[PDB]
Design a binder for these strands. Structure first.
Ligand code: K
Ligand code: K
Ligand code: MG
Ligand code: MG
Ligand code: MG
Ligand code: MG
Ligand code: MG
Ligand code: MG
Ligand code: MG
Ligand code: MG
Ligand code: MG
Ligand code: MG
Ligand code: MG
Ligand code: MG
Ligand code: MG
Ligand code: MG
Ligand code: MG
Ligand code: MG
Ligand code: MG
Ligand code: MG
Ligand code: MG
Ligand code: MG
Ligand code: MG
Ligand code: MG
Ligand code: MG
Ligand code: MG
Ligand code: MG
Ligand code: MG
Ligand code: MG
Ligand code: MG
Ligand code: MG
Ligand code: MG
Ligand code: MG
Ligand code: MG
Ligand code: MG
Ligand code: MG
Ligand code: MG
Ligand code: MG
Ligand code: MG
Ligand code: MG
Ligand code: MG
Ligand code: MG
Ligand code: MG
Ligand code: MG
Ligand code: MG
Ligand code: MG
Ligand code: MG
Ligand code: MG
Ligand code: MG
Ligand code: NA
Lengths: 203, 101, 144, 213, 214
RNA sequence: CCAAAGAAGGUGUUAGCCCAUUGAGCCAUAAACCUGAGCGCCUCAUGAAUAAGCGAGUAGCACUGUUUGGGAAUGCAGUGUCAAGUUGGCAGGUAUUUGUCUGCCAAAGUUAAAUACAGAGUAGGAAGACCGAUAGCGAACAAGUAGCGUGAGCGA
RNA sequence: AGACCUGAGUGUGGCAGGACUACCCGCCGAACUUAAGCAUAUUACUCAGCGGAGGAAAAGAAAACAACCGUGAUUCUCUCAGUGAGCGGCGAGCGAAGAGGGAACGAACUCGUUGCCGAAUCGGGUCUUACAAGGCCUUGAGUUGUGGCACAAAUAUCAU
């Protein structure tokens, strides 16, 4: 169908035409706010894959995050203790930028539920992610079996707990078996399993 | 085809306890190795519309001046895989041969 | 029980068997295995030779299950034969069949003199075990 | 875990002519400047506070447990060992005391009490009744207010027919298929007075075996 | 002094002990008898709710994988659709009559498939299927007499109808064959082992010989 | 004298029979819960008797940093660079280039139970070889009270 | 004139903010201490800090193990195993996984994509005892795509 042409066009991101389209959009996004509400997704084919539908109660926002490594917020770049913990500029955040973008959106608008997000554009200083959010009070959402689950309170601020796709990515949850034994179901859960001292009644 | 039976001993070329082996069953994942005519056609139309990437232009010029070994090294550095580097070079060789006529 | 420990015998002895001179301090030698090469070298050298250093090839991701290979000697084979079959077993007649891998063994080794001839099914057999069991009227059948 | 340590309680040092022990901070209170955190200080933490992962329970070899039950049963058939344990068995007809199966049909405690008098087990029951008293010491403050002696143990073949015997103070009921060493040798002393029911008695060879079977 | 002792490696250098300033990291089993009673109480309560269906669904027989355990048999996750097809059952329908279905498990041999097909056939023979409408009974459904006579499995592994896992029969005593009296078994096994062990270096010697041929 | 009730509280000394307890059973019920997926009516739903594809700034790779038992790199992050899908891709715990085999099909989502409650709460219960008023929670009592400190807090 | 794209104002109907935080999820993150000194290491992917839920949470239906006669979502337990794995000034120390016995288990489903259809879709009025999974109406939203059918537990479906 028409999806295949849309999907393959977005795989040629380095072509002449796609760089021109992204150059215009990146310039426009530079002169907008950090959070912007959209009427329609910029990549309808990508948004639909991630769960977006053109129904009442689905909202798309474009979120901007600044690029680069994390600087440790120590006063005057002065650390204490062992020299192993002396780095200021060279450490990296253990959370990816897509997860940061989702967390900024969900924290700002508490009436919505963050579903998913995708990459739209980059720039020398900024990264743009479009976030799909769902209104839980909408009647269309509350009666749709495909999206009904998000109304339940256990999914409140799921992006703040790393439950979205981007959150699962930096948790190591894309892997199974011998590549993920120490981080399943979580790093803390495996640590508790491996470090609690067990006292059997008859030992 | 019928799998080769086992010899019934712990060592050797067909080692293992003897059972009546069954042939490999067809699976829905078997079509992954089937050529995708329509997906290829969609990619061809898109490729003609958008032109060539900066890597593709650089690799094509290497094959024009005859530096075919340098093209492989350039692809390998950018793509990071030797299998991927050959396919990118092979695709640009076909594109060069197509543009002759 | 607390009433049997040396503490009860030391009530009124003040120093509790640690002396007035050296006393009982916190860590007078260091903690744990500290100083294995400095100031505890003699204890390590005469009681644990070989403790320090490296040796041999590495084996990443060792799986003990593929290496499973318990052994049983020829003179222990009666442990796996029922009593009534052992009496009836004699060279030239009908002998009991021993499935080693179902009894938890993989290799027949062959130390000592066999006590009852039998047919042994094994995954492995030593060259001496195969020779001795055949001379005694039994046989070895390979299994997997 | 926090008991006796719920204070700031820093030591004052050597310059002030007081012992070098942590002292409660602040002022305006009788507890300010008082010793703290020490097993020798009032309101401080006890030495080596008790933990819940102490070894409360024990493993016993399965064969050794059956050996003990077997030894306790053999001792119960020796009248001198039963007398030496404190039971009044001076009027019972025979040791081991085996009675007919009809006691399991009893419905009223009156019938069961009459049966205990016929086989002269009531003397050991009476010994228990006269021994009932308030426990000496702190245990009476806990839920251990009353103490008494053991008395005879009546062994039935199954879990039936105990209706008329439950309320008889000083008589314990046992199942032949689950015999407890704690009841067969109270206080670790062998020689419990056991009244056997005929069906339970005939099951003993199958349950415990023989020297050859 | 220290003396002759094992060099200790007791670990316990983390904050495992609960005290003041430490929550601890411990797990005791003081609730083990109470949880054991609860599990049995829940199982008996569940059997009443699902009566007269068996408490545990039917499971296949599988071979334990590893060469250390490949002589053993145990219950598997569920019956393969190929096994269910050979017993004339639709897998979606089979899931409604207490049969576990596992679509991942392949059937690489006939013996493993046949024993599981036999289990399904035995289960179907003993199955009493209650009618959706007792006044209008359809084919393959039980009559009112069998419905009132239904009893619950309640087995721990749910194998009253099919029995336990089947192990191969032990070989009966026999006589030593003529070939067995003279055949060197060690030589036969060692030759086979050396063929695989030196397969790479034997072919290279042969392949290098062909280079010298031309 | 009672006991299918000996059960441990109260009562002016130590109580089976002074009192209360200790059992069958009886009565009353928003909804929800369980019961031939309980059973009728109206309404509305509903079962049975030919080729193509499958998730892209994603996976990889480089550098740096961190984490891991994971060691020519176990996961992850930043930037650069960035695929394949014509037996394709990923994994197969010593790096590379080949060619054979085995398993699986990433980059979208929901999901009960078995598990935690290591200084939580609500409504109830069962206990203890524990402490016994300098003990046991700081607090058996108008206790986080009186009192102290500008305050964070401290605290009988 | 008007449209529709983008963006505003107001009316109408709703939601977020705070508390709790033992356990759980995400980030951030020390040092005392041990190494008889100390810097890698250790304490510890711990305390403190910042966020977010629930009666549990998280995980979960194979881009999984294995290398077998093969197993078959997740979680947990014994064991694997303080390990002839491994990591480590190869020092002090650190340190798992598959298999096996078990607990639990009616355990499986949805979208996107591809084909065939195509507004059959959603809200809002109104009526049926009814803010019906119903009928009728509705440009309001939606063709920049809502729904339907079939995709290995499958082999037609659609009218009668
Ligand atoms: K040490
Ligand atoms: K660490
Ligand atoms: Mg520091
Ligand atoms: Mg595990
Ligand atoms: Mg464990
Ligand atoms: Mg541990
Ligand atoms: Mg003195
Ligand atoms: Mg002296
Ligand atoms: Mg001494
Ligand atoms: Mg000394
Ligand atoms: Mg001296
Ligand atoms: Mg020195
Ligand atoms: Mg070396
Ligand atoms: Mg105290
Ligand atoms: Mg007295
Ligand atoms: Mg006293
Ligand atoms: Mg009672
Ligand atoms: Mg000496
Ligand atoms: Mg000395
Ligand atoms: Mg010694
Ligand atoms: Mg404290
Ligand atoms: Mg019915
Ligand atoms: Mg009283
Ligand atoms: Mg009552
Ligand atoms: Mg019905
Ligand atoms: Mg895919
Ligand atoms: Mg990338
Ligand atoms: Mg580390
Ligand atoms: Mg690394
Ligand atoms: Mg790295
Ligand atoms: Mg989930
Ligand atoms: Mg108790
Ligand atoms: Mg006082
Ligand atoms: Mg007090
Ligand atoms: Mg006090
Ligand atoms: Mg410390
Ligand atoms: Mg030091
Ligand atoms: Mg020191
Ligand atoms: Mg120092
Ligand atoms: Mg904390
Ligand atoms: Mg639960
Ligand atoms: Mg959940
Ligand atoms: Mg599994
Ligand atoms: Mg061991
Ligand atoms: Mg560590
Ligand atoms: Mg298992
Ligand atoms: Mg297990
Ligand atoms: Mg309507
Ligand atoms: Mg659709
Ligand atoms: Na009712």
């Amino acid at each position: 169908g028409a999806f295949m042409y849309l999907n393959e066009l977005w795989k040629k991101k380095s072509s002449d035409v796609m760089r021109f389209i992204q150059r215009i959009r990146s310039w426009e996004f530079r002169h907008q706010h950090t959070v912007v509400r959209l009427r329609r997704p910029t990549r309808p084919e990508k948004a639909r894959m991630l769960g977006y539908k053109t129904k009442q109660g689905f909202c798309v926002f474009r979120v901007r995050v600044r690029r680069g490594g994390r600087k440790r917020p120590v006063h005057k770049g002065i650390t204490y203790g062992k020299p192993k913990t002396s780095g200021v500029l060279g450490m990296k955040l253990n959370k990816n930028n897509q997860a940061v973008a989702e967390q900024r959106l969900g924290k700002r608008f508490g009436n919505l539920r963050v579903l998913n997000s995708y990459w739209v554009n980059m720039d020398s200083t900024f990264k743009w992610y479009e976030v799909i959010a769902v209104d839980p009070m909408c009647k269309t959402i509350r009666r749709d079996p495909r999206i009904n689950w998000i109304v339940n309170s256990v999914h409140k601020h799921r992006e703040q707990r790393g439950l979205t796709s981007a959150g699962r990515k930096h948790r190591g949850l894309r892997h199974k078996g011998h590549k993920a034994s120490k981080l399943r179901p979580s790093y803390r859960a495996a640590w508790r399993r491996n470090n609690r001292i067990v006292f059997l009644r008859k030992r | 085809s019928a799998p080769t039976p086992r010899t019934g001993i712990i060592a050797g070329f067909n080692k293992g306890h003897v059972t009546t082996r069954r042939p490999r069953q067809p699976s829905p994942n078997d079509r992954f190795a089937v050529p995708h005519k329509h997906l290829r056609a969609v990619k061809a139309i898109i490729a003609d519309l958008v032109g060539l990437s900066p890597l593709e232009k650089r690799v094509q010029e290497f094959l024009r001046v005859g530096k075919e070994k340098r093209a492989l090294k350039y692809c390998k550095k950018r793509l990071g895989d030797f299998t991927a580097a050959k396919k990118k070079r092979s695709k640009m060789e076909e594109a060069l041969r197509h543009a002759t006529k | 029980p607390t009433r049997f420990k040396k503490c009860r015998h030391q009530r009124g002895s003040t120093f509790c068997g640690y002396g007035r001179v050296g006393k009982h301090r916190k860590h007078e030698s260091g903690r744990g295995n500290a100083g294995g090469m400095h100031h505890h070298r003699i204890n390590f050298d005469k009681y644990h030779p070989g403790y320090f250093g490296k040796l041999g090839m590495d084996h990443y991701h060792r799986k003990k299950n593929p290496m499973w290979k318990p052994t049983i000697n020829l003179n222990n084979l009666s442990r796996l034969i029922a009593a009534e079959e052992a009496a009836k077993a004699a060279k030239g007649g009908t002998l009991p069949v021993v499935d080693l891998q179902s009894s938890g063994y993989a290799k027949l080794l062959g130390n000592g003199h066999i006590q009852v001839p039998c047919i042994v099914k094994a995954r492995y057999v030593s060259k001496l075990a195969d020779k001795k069991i055949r001379k005694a009227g039994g046989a070895v059948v390979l299994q997997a | 875990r926090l008991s006796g340590m719920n204070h700031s309680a820093h030591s004052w040092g050597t310059g002030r002519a007081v012992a070098r022990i942590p002292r409660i901070s602040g002022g305006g209170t009788s507890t300010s400047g008082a010793g703290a955190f020490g097993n020798m200080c009032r309101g401080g933490r006890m030495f080596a506070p008790t933990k819940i992962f102490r070894r409360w329970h024990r493993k016993i070899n399965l064969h050794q447990k059956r050996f003990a039950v077997v030894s306790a049963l053999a001792a119960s058939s020796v009248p001198s060992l039963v007398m030496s344990r404190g039971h009044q068995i001076g009027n019972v007809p025979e040791v081991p005391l085996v009675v007919e199966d009809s006691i399991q049909g009893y419905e009223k405690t009156k019938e069961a009490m009459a049966f205990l008098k016929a086989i002269a087990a009531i003397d050991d029951v009476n010994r228990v009744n006269d021994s009932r008293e308030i426990r000496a010491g702190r245990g009476k403050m806990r839920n251990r207010r009353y103490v008494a002696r053991r008395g005879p143990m009546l062994v039935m073949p199954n879990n039936k027919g105990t209706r008329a015997f439950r309320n008889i103070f000083g008589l314990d009921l046992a199942n032949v298929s689950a015999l407890n060493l704690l009841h067969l040798a109270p206080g670790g002393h062998v020689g419990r007075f056991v009244i056997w029911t005929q069906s339970a008695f005939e099951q003993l060879d199958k349950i415990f075996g023989t020297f050859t079977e | 002094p220290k003396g002759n002792n094992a060099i200790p490696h007791v670990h316990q250098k983390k904050h495992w002990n609960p005290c003041s300033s430490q929550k601890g990291n411990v797990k005791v089993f003081l609730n083990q008898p109470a949880q054991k009673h609860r599990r049995r109480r829940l199982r008996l309560l569940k059997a009443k709710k699902v009566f007269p269906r068996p408490l545990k669904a039917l499971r296949p027989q599988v071979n334990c994988p590893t060469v250390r355990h490949n002589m053993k048999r145990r219950l598997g996750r569920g019956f393969s659709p190929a096994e269910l097809k050979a017993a004339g059952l639709n897998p979606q329908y089979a899931a409604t009559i207490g049969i576990r279905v596992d679509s991942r498990r392949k059937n690489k041999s006939e013996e493993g498939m046949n024993v599981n097909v036999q289990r399904l056939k035995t289960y179907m023979s003993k199955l009493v299927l209650f009618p959706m409408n007792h006044k209008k009974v359809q084919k393959g459904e039980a009559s009112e007499e069998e419905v009132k006579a239904a009893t619950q499995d309640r087995s721990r592994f749910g194998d009253a109808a099919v029995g336990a896992v089947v192990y191969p029969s032990a070989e009966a005593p026999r006589a030593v064959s003529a070939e067995e009296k003279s055949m060197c078994v060690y030589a036969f096994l060692k030759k086979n082992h050396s063929a695989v062990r030196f397969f790479g270096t034997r072919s290279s010697r042969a392949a290098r010989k062909e280079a010298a041929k031309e």
